[PDB]
Design a protein around this ligand. Structure first.
Ligand code: NA
Ligand code: NA
Ligand code: NA
Ligand code: NA
Ligand code: NA
Ligand code: NA
Lengths: 497, 497, 497, 497
């Protein structure tokens, strides 16, 4: 069956990244279902630690660990077994009363905090990977557009000439700082609260560092109250998502304006646009609007979480609001969609240049030229050039057709006196490519300057990927160590005890 | 005239920190007035840099710089001169048309972004200092309460025995992470966007690193669009304030419950409480409630700022919402108030111990004892002890009066069988101080464990203060370098040119 | 399999209303699935209207309408058919190209706005029914507690004597105003935007009033742009939910404090409490905390929706955030839970009276007595009585043991002079039941006054139920008229054409 | 001194409504200063009522009332006297100890709730007046633009032809519903809580209806707890402000896009635009952006207030967040600014018509014509016309130059067959004015339909003004009755007692 939305101007298939925006809502797991596999890993790590500590015998440990595998299989289709007390009761029905010993020295409170952290930790690495991919698309696109002259806007009005590459490198710098925010957050998420038990620790001689290591954490949440009451990392995860997405909304909005029927300086790839069921002319920026929708929605978890923390004491509380899978899934869909939008965007280079040459964004360079050539102060030069623009608009003279006569008349009308500049001084000031070339300092649009920023960003992206690879491998190594330990116990009991 | 609110049970004067909560609203500056002195520093730094670059002569620079001092004095009483174009026009009226040259290579856009950053930077150091003072009060209070046995709560129900010191060290760990959040933010705030001009840089040969150094920044906002469009640091400052304050609200709420007429396990110092105009019995927790009010209000800037960023393009925009002085002033007042609340809080040690001994928080240790002594699983032990509690409540037996007979009856009623434990096993399990001593692992309430955390926090506080001293001195050194440079130019022109 | 959470002090089963809090998240529909049946009704109403207008023949109409029934059945298990263009394409595959004629004069834009309104309209009646049930439980509980003397709190400190009935009638008045907010909103939700088509109407001669009537709407959204761009009713629905739930959070918090181990003036029914997996003494207020959680979470949709409206133009936009089924489902679960909490709450009448008599809430009446009997001004009387309290606390004298000697000493200590009041004047002022009886004006706790409020609320509840019955019946009558019209067309075509 | 921002293209003076956006922040009162005059009226009304009830003698009443006038004068310059206990103490210093009797039967709690309500009530009438003025400007502008053909947008893409009048009437309908929201809120704000005293009423025999009438309230907040704990009206006021302002942001954004350099279909009046300190070409939409800024900021109070209510019990609490004068002042400034923007907006009628005729918004009418003329279904007609657009864009054919040849080729290319329509059928379908005339139903853009909506809105505006006049006069009559009563008491005591 064909995709019934791909009619008229919506040619071909949706890009996969565009389709993600339509799929995440129905596919999202509940928080309980998303965290359950991590809870199951925690049971194994806790039991292994209790065995190292002599609290459980190897025989008891093996019986429990084999039972966990059986109950996990039951829970794959029976969602009622995905919360703790139901799961423990199924374990007791499966292996007998020794099941209850897996809770020695532990609570649902530290289990819940730890499992949520493991879920958020994996989702944070998923998010960092997606943000790196977005930054890669932005920087790699910029590298092909060092000569793509176009105007930059302030207050939704044409400001001065830049290049598309220069614009994209603003987004790259935004993303670099968001990657810092997320890595900083990761260090706070990746702390283990297990051993806090209910909120006060336990008299059982746990080794909190072992459980933490077996589960891939990089350190402990030390104080036992902080271990169960601490929630600021959840609020912070919601915040970084919201602020990151606000910059994604701003880029989506920018592109939506560029691709209006009236600006027509860029066009979305067909695979990132839809159409209308009634209006056959529509090429609709549905990828952009649904990406913005995700940005706006991300405000919601942030406010709910912070409201809940403002409403309680510094205690474990079941009233705290969570960061849920569907919210993260929306962020990933929007990030992937905007990655593809940027990669595949079609700039209209001729129209971009036309606006830059014709619509008066070159007037700052004309003003700076007067100051530099005749030494007047900036305020008087500005008033002369504003008069040039006013007269040029009234007479229908595009910026690139402004000449010596119009400039002299404005100087006379505004000052009573002419001004000692040549026709060539004016022509060169009004050339939009010369406007770009003259802006050659750090962070400015001249190609040599933008290329310097690209070179720096490519080195930063290498470091971004290395950080992610290291963090991912640390978790994979820990998960394998735990799996090996579980099999050692089960098999040694089966064959030798 | 006496403070008319200090009547009846509101004895003595308000503590100064308590009075701050009443004073900040009327005393707060507008953002324009708060940022204006930083704008004036920017004018000096920009002009000095233009002089180094040969864009201004020393004579022009001296004329401008002396004029800035004159207009600054006018603006001290004439608020109409505290925005840019009015200020520049007053400068022109004061020194002549050369005033206009101070805007060469610059815009209101990069000026505004930089001045706001300098304001927020100083307010961030102010906030870090206040948060350090709060953490100092918390840790120093904890050190005097290693033996102050009391219950910890979960879900507003008595959970297990801890000490007041252990509780306070949860707050210390919360604050350590908030200090990290603020220092991480500082690195993003303390970047200079000057040289971006309108949004695209300039053809004038500025030295962006010099202006940055003269103003105490540690690096540049490199890309010129990011320099004027970037606002994520403002959202992030609002967020860290909100999350930090949510933990302050939680502590205030905790203390408010402790000091209810019904709990009566702590009492506010008289200097942090008020009374009622009608009800003479009231000792009201006004310091706590107004501190929470500031926490709730801090949600507002966070949402407004993020909404504004979600509403625009990746451009300079006058539609962005700001973080305003009154919001930061409220945070500081609440932080100071809670610092004094904690320092001066009066715990009722006898009542705290009574609740711990009598109200069943020791039942976990009774359960753990059964598991440890007779080897039953945790789930069956829990059911026996729950029956002990149910029977004890029905018969009016306080926890510390539970004995061998009641425990054996519960085992029989719930299991048909007695249980092989002694009267001394039970007595020791129900002793709340022994509950504390048994919880001796990392982050647990035993005195040796809490003291370890205190020792660590004292070392961390030394590092917190050193970071703040270094950051403050860097800004002071830069401000003196700028002041010296300005005087060099003015005096050299006056005497030698 | 037993409910594994019902162990220890969590006796019996969860109340059904309590269980609802655990079930709504996994059971919630997506918005697409929730709105789809309303979209299907819209197709029928639009087609019937087109038939009345002569745009479709009866034969074309019958073919389409029979096909809608077939595609609806396919969509019951194939979720891919629950959005418009996929559904229309399935209709074309089922009945042929005439399927396309059902879109004459219509768009996905007016369809979407109308279907969302029909969904929200039904959910608003569901919510009004639940809020009425909550108010019923509150008022009916109050009627049994006109004599249940207890203290009211301000600032979490004991204030003056009231009754439990008086307190509950505050909640009733809150709920009356929330019911007004919801009925006011209903009038704006129950307006039909169909006929706006894309945003500008259509040249086809639709009868917008007929489609509206067939779908149960009470009027039109007149202007075609407002018909597709209008979203304020969605924001308003989110707001009323949030403000209503904030009052529900406040009641839940109040009850949570009453039922602390320290206040112990009320106890939750066992069917509304849980316990701990580790601490056998816990009787945890899980119903209250999860109800508050829903209140906090309701802030999220409100902010996301308003952010999205602040981010766009006055246009149809796919970037607008929606009010989703899971949010409404949470509100209903919390409302039902709190209805059952209130109905089944167990006040400890003796302890309530003890606090009222002993903990100094009667001091206002002692002060008023001095003013009334000896004519001193209120401020001087207040200072004398504050001294009484200070001395009584120091000496360990409960309020009901304060006598003539202590009052005379306070008058002397604070004023140098005794005071001409009798022992009986004091005894009667300190009797907490007399405090209640003396407060006999409108809205005050005396039984005759509270009963007057109950009588008024019972009359209001009758009107609340009548409004709901009328609104529900109007929708049921319209749905039957539409169903009859569809069958008339299908059967007339089958037999007579 | 000239307005230094009026340089270059910022000709003339700022409009007064535009200047309001720059002035409100520094001019705003604190809440304490804004509410103080209402508190002073409450003192008079309470004292008059106590006199009617015989609680105060006429002589005591006269002494108090004359003293209130003296302390009010002191407080005009001494802000320390603007809170209750300081004010009462100044009254005692002025007239003696009888000052204390003005607090008989009252608290700061009911005083505060009532004074805030009187402040919000006046600000709500101020807001309703401003919203009526905005609606007047919108409707009166629409009446001059029934023939101003232009495109409407969906998803920021050109959709179909409408008129500027039709668009403005969408805003009028939005505003009508916001006026309903505000009048509905007024009925809840204008209820008197006085007589609740601390929270439980009083044994003094107050006449709560008299105090209410003297202060202009229309009814009571009956239950005494609701009288002091009730705050939902504050949250609701914040919400209506936020939702109303979101529609104002959307109109501002719409106009900002219309007035881009690229759309250029409208131009702001010079008096509502600014310029740049650096870029002389700028005509910046500063009125629009600062209006949007106010909209975004209005989210903040809404969230803070609701957070505070979610954080407490159903009690009087000093932790509740308030709606502050500066927030309302911002709303009024933005509403006035947008009133002037709309009144003075300059549409470019020729460019609006050009886009409507050339940029393919007429394609729906071409599609509807095929269905109507040859009877094909809507889906097949849509596919043919989409091909027309695709081919026309590729060949550079503007919509109004599409003819029979291009339509037949598209039918053949997409269907293998021609289509039986004439050149005149096509020409008439592509005429944008005929597109408007054909859309003649309720709420559609044809002039006769828009004029019907204007006639209805003019009748509604008459009713809006009558409601406001009645509500205002009721408050003025009450204030005069109170003033007369105060003078009666003072003068009768002076001359006859
Ligand atoms: Na950070
Ligand atoms: Na954290
Ligand atoms: Na930043
Ligand atoms: Na309403
Ligand atoms: Na509405
Ligand atoms: Na209300």
């Amino acid at each position: 069956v064909p995709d019934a939305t791909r009619i008229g101007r919506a040619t071909g298939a949706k890009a996969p990244e565009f389709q993600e925006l339509y799929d995440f809502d129905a596919a999202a797991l509940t928080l309980t279902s998303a965290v359950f596999p991590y809870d199951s890993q925690i049971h194994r790590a806790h039991v292994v630690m209790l065995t190292e500590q002599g609290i459980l015998t190897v025989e008891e440990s093996a019986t429990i660990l084999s039972g966990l595998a059986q109950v996990d299989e039951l829970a794959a289709t029976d969602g009622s077994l995905r919360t703790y007390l139901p799961y423990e009761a199924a374990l007791k029905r499966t292996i007998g009363s020794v099941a209850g010993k897996m809770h020695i020295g532990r609570s649902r409170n530290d289990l819940a905090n730890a499992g949520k952290r493991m879920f958020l930790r994996d989702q944070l690495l998923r998010t960092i990977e997606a943000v790196i991919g977005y930054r890669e698309a932005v920087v790699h696109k910029a590298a092909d557009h060092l000569d793509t002259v176009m105007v930059v806007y302030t207050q939704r009005k044409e400001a001065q000439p830049i290049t598309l590459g220069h614009y994209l490198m603003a987004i790259s710098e935004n993303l670099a700082k968001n990657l810092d925010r997320y890595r900083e957050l990761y260090a706070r998420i990746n702390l283990c609260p297990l051993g806090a038990a209910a909120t006060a620790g336990t008299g059982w001689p746990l080794n909190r560092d072992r459980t933490s290591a077996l589960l891939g954490f990089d350190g402990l949440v030390v104080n036992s109250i902080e271990g169960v009451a601490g929630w600021d990392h959840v609020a912070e995860h919601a915040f970084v998502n919201a602020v990151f997405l606000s910059g994604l909304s701003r880029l989506a909005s920018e592109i939506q304006l560029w691709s209006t029927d009236e600006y027509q300086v860029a066009e979305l790839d067909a695979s990132f646009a839809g159409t209308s069921s009634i209006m056959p002319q529509k090429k609709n920026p549905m990828s952009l609007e649904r990406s913005r929708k995700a940005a706006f929605a991300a405000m919601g978890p942030l406010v709910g979480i912070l409201t809940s923390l403002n409403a309680i004491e510094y205690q474990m509380s079941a009233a705290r609001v969570e960061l849920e899978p569907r919210s993260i899934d929306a962020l990933i869909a929007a990030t992937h969609a905007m990655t593809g939008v940027v990669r595949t965007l079609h700039p209209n280079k001729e129209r971009m240049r036309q606006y830059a040459a014709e619509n008066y964004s070159t007037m700052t360079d004309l003003t700076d030229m007067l100051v530099r050539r005749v030494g007047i102060d900036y305020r008087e030069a500005h008033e002369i050039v504003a008069h040039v623009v006013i007269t040029a608009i009234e007479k229908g003279i595009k910026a690139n057709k402004i000449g010596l006569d119009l400039v002299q008349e404005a100087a006379v009308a505004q000052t009573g006196a002419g001004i000692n500049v040549s026709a060539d001084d004016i022509k060169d000031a009004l050339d939009p490519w010369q406007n770009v070339l003259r802006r050659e300092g750090k962070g400015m649009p001249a190609p040599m300057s933008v290329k310097a920023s690209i070179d720096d960003a490519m080195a930063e992206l290498h470091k971004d990927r290395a950080w992610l690879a290291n963090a991912t491998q640390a978790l994979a190594n820990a998960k394998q160590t735990l799996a090996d330990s579980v099999q050692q116990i089960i098999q040694t009991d089966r064959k030798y005890l």
